[PDB]
Design a protein that fits this description.
32% strand, EC 3.4.21.4, mainly beta, binds calcium ion, Peptidase_S1_PA, 2 helices, 6-stranded antiparallel barrel, binds 4-carbamimidamidobenzoic acid, Thrombin, subunit H
């Protein structure tokens, strides 16, 4: 997160850390056994870490559950990042509590101007490298499709939306990818890509979650 604030331990209970010997992407707990993340976070050997604040210290409240399968969306395209969505099945169910909870899927897409919360343990530096220990947060509005497109001509599909600030100085960045964009309580976006981090006129681009509700439900119901 570039330009965000420390969230406060356990205040974003659906936030997960994808780990393979170090934190590499986030995700969101959408139920006791399934996490949604980005298809580009895919790798084998993933341990899902729930209930984390400081990712370098065991402080209590943590649940380390391995991934039992990851399902990249079948039309995910790595050159464009269209369909940049993946579902992870946990090997056992998580203990949901006040520090580990799931986030609702949307029933409709969010409109421009909606304010959302992006969270992640990604880089905090726009020009440079600085990973945080604790979770960072950033409030950011969904931008109009007009503006999203005029910033990334020819690269925005109908499965993406831009959110953030055109001025620069506030955006998601490397290591935030996979994590959530929550709006009025629902999961509307997945941290997917952008040009640089926090650069003016180059907002963050997000997987459009509402277009995937039926796929998720169907996929989960048969796995
Ligand atoms: C994911 O790690 C990721 C997503 C988005 C960006 N760029 C911007 N938000 N500008 C970087 C890395
Ligand atoms: Ca920890």
């Amino acid at each position: 997160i570039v330009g965000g604030y420390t969230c406060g331990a356990n205040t974003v209970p659906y936030q997960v850390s994808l780990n393979s010997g170090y934190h590499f992407c986030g995700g969101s707990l959408i139920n006791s056994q399934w996490v949604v993340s980005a298809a580009h976070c895919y790798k084998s050997g993933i341990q899902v870490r729930l209930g984390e604040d400081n990712i370098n210290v065991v402080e209590g409240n943590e649940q380390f559950i391995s991934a039992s399968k990851s399902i990249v969306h079948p039309s995910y395209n790595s050159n464009t990042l269209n369909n940049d969505i993946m579902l992870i099945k946990l090997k056992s169910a998580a203990s949901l509590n006040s520090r580990v909870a799931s986030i609702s899927l949307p029933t409709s897409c969010a409109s421009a101007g909606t304010q959302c919360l992006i969270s992640g343990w990604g880089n905090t530096k726009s020009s440079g490298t600085s990973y945080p220990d604790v979770l960072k947060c950033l409030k950011a509005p969904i931008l109009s499709d007009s503006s999203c497109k005029s910033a990334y001509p020819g690269q925005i599909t109908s499965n993406m939306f831009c959110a953030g600030y055109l001025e620069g100085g506030k955006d998601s960045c490397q290591g935030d990818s996979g994590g959530p964009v929550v709006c009025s309580g629902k999961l509307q976006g997945i941290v997917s890509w952008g040009s640089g981090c926090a650069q003016k006129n180059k907002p963050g681009v997000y997987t459009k979650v509402c277009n995937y509700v039926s796929w998720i439900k169907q996929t989960i119901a048969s796995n």
